[PDB]
């Protein structure tokens, strides 16, 4: 039940918890 990127679709590992509004993305997916 891992957080998938709100843009690409892949799991956002705890390494790459991008801070948008309220959820998780990756670096280039911000
Ligand atoms: Zn992504």
Swiss-Prot record:
Q: Which InterPro entries match?
A: LIM-SH3_domain_protein, Znf_LIM
Q: Which GO terms describe its cellular component?
A: cortical actin cytoskeleton
List modified residues, type N-acetylmethionine.
1
Enumerate the Pfam families for this protein: LIM
The entry's keywords: Acetylation, Actin-binding, Cytoplasm, Cytoskeleton, Ion transport, LIM domain, Metal-binding, Phosphoprotein, Repeat, Transport, Zinc
Q: What is its main location?
A: cytoplasm
Q: Which residues form the LIM zinc-binding domain?
A: 5-30
Q: Which cysteines are joined by disulfide bonds?
A: none
Quote the subcellular location field of this record.
Cytoplasm, Cell cortex; Cytoplasm, Cytoskeleton
Describe the processing and modification events after translation. Phosphorylated.
| GO terms, molecular function | actin binding; metal ion binding; monoatomic ion transmembrane transporter activity
Q: Name the domain of life this protein comes from.
A: Eukaryota
Say what the protein does: Plays an important role in the regulation of dynamic actin-based, cytoskeletal activities. Agonist-dependent changes in LASP1 phosphorylation may also serve to regulate actin-associated ion transport activities, not only in the parietal cell but also in certain other F-actin-rich secretory epithelial cell types.
Protein name per Swiss-Prot or TrEMBL: LIM and SH3 domain protein 1
Q: Which gene encodes it?
A: LASP1
């Amino acid at each position: 039940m891992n957080p998938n990127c709100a843009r690409c679709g892949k799991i956002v590992y705890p390494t790459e918890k991008v801070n948008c509004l309220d959820k998780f993305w990756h670096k280039a997916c911000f």
